Amino acid sequence: MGKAENYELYQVELGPGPSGDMAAKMSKKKAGRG
DSSP states (O other), X not given: OOSOOOSSSSOSSOSOOXXXXXXXXXXXXXXXXX
């Protein structure tokens, strides 16, 4: 609550890493535990 979230907003191919892979040490939330 407060910040509110959308359904498919940031789900638009986040992380701009086309050629090769991504890894700029900023948003690394692939899937650790769960």
